[PDB]
Structure 1
Amino acid sequence: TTCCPSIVAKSNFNACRLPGTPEALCATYTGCIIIPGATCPGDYAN
Protein backbone atom coordinates (compact mmCIF):
# COMPACT_ATOMS: atom_id res chain seq x y z
CA THR A 1 0.00 0.00 0.00
CA THR A 2 1.37 3.36 -0.97
CA CYS A 3 0.93 6.19 1.50
CA CYS A 4 1.84 9.66 0.32
CA PRO A 5 2.41 13.07 1.86
CA SER A 6 -0.17 14.70 -0.38
CA ILE A 7 -2.47 14.26 -3.35
CA VAL A 8 0.12 15.94 -5.56
CA ALA A 9 2.80 13.47 -4.48
CA LYS A 10 0.42 10.53 -5.02
CA SER A 11 -0.57 11.83 -8.47
CA ASN A 12 3.14 11.91 -9.33
CA PHE A 13 3.60 8.43 -7.91
CA ASN A 14 0.70 7.07 -9.97
CA ALA A 15 2.12 8.69 -13.14
CA CYS A 16 5.51 7.02 -12.44
CA ARG A 17 3.79 3.64 -11.95
CA LEU A 18 1.63 3.80 -15.12
CA PRO A 19 4.38 2.59 -17.54
CA GLY A 20 5.52 -0.04 -14.98
CA THR A 21 8.30 1.70 -13.06
CA PRO A 22 9.22 -0.19 -9.86
CA GLU A 23 7.29 0.97 -6.82
CA ALA A 24 10.36 1.66 -4.64
CA LEU A 25 11.77 4.02 -7.28
CA CYS A 26 8.49 5.90 -7.61
CA ALA A 27 8.30 6.09 -3.81
CA THR A 28 11.70 7.78 -3.50
CA TYR A 29 10.86 10.13 -6.41
CA THR A 30 7.72 11.35 -4.64
CA GLY A 31 8.15 10.97 -0.89
CA CYS A 32 5.45 8.27 -0.78
CA ILE A 33 6.12 5.35 1.59
CA ILE A 34 5.24 1.71 1.15
CA ILE A 35 3.67 -0.32 3.86
CA PRO A 36 2.30 -3.78 3.91
CA GLY A 37 -0.93 -3.03 5.72
CA ALA A 38 -4.13 -2.32 3.68
CA THR A 39 -4.67 1.06 5.35
CA CYS A 40 -2.53 4.18 5.51
CA PRO A 41 -2.08 5.87 8.86
CA GLY A 42 -3.85 9.06 9.69
CA ASP A 43 -4.39 11.39 6.80
CA TYR A 44 -1.75 10.10 4.33
CA ALA A 45 -3.00 9.91 0.81
CA ASN A 46 -3.47 6.29 -0.32
Structure 2
Amino acid sequence: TTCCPSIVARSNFNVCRLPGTPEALCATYTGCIIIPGATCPGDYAN
Protein backbone atom coordinates (compact mmCIF):
# COMPACT_ATOMS: atom_id res chain seq x y z
CA THR A 1 0.00 0.00 0.00
CA THR A 2 2.12 2.85 1.29
CA CYS A 3 5.64 1.66 0.73
CA CYS A 4 8.82 3.69 0.94
CA PRO A 5 12.41 3.27 -0.37
CA SER A 6 13.97 3.21 3.07
CA ILE A 7 12.47 3.25 6.59
CA VAL A 8 13.90 6.76 6.93
CA ALA A 9 11.39 7.95 4.33
CA ARG A 10 8.54 6.17 6.12
CA SER A 11 9.40 7.81 9.43
CA ASN A 12 9.69 11.09 7.53
CA PHE A 13 6.21 10.35 6.15
CA ASN A 14 4.98 9.72 9.72
CA VAL A 15 6.46 12.96 11.05
CA CYS A 16 5.10 14.82 8.04
CA ARG A 17 1.55 13.57 8.65
CA LEU A 18 1.91 14.09 12.40
CA PRO A 19 -0.18 17.36 12.37
CA GLY A 20 -2.54 15.71 9.89
CA THR A 21 -0.80 16.57 6.64
CA PRO A 22 -2.32 15.02 3.45
CA GLU A 23 -0.86 11.61 2.62
CA ALA A 24 -0.28 12.47 -1.04
CA LEU A 25 1.67 15.54 0.01
CA CYS A 26 3.96 13.66 2.38
CA ALA A 27 4.25 10.65 0.07
CA THR A 28 5.46 12.87 -2.75
CA TYR A 29 7.73 14.87 -0.43
CA THR A 30 9.37 11.66 0.80
CA GLY A 31 9.24 9.35 -2.19
CA CYS A 32 6.71 6.86 -0.86
CA ILE A 33 4.19 5.28 -3.20
CA ILE A 34 0.56 4.66 -2.29
CA ILE A 35 -0.73 1.64 -4.19
CA PRO A 36 -4.08 -0.22 -3.86
CA GLY A 37 -2.26 -3.50 -3.29
CA ALA A 38 -0.93 -4.32 0.16
CA THR A 39 1.75 -6.56 -1.29
CA CYS A 40 5.13 -4.84 -1.40
CA PRO A 41 8.23 -7.01 -2.02
CA GLY A 42 11.06 -6.73 0.50
CA ASP A 43 12.91 -4.96 -2.30
CA TYR A 44 10.72 -1.89 -1.76
CA ALA A 45 8.87 -2.77 1.44
CA ASN A 46 10.06 -0.07 3.80
State how far apart, in whole Å, the 2-side matches of 1:24 and 1:2 are. 10
Following TM superposition, the consecutive aligned residue runs of length 4 or more in structure 1 with deviations greater than 4 angstroms are: none
Query: RMSD over aligned Cα, in angstroms?
Result: 1.4
State how far apart, in whole Å, the 2-side matches of 1:29 and 1:16 are. 9
Count of aligned residue pairs for this structure pair: 46
What TM-score results when the alignment is normalised by the length of structure 2? 0.79
Give percent identity, aligned residues only: 96
Following superposition, the deviation at residue 24 of structure 1 comes to 0.3
What TM-score results when the alignment is normalised by the length of structure 1? 0.79
Residue segments in structure 2 that go unaligned for 5+ positions in a row: none
Following superposition, the deviation at residue 40 of structure 1 comes to 2.3
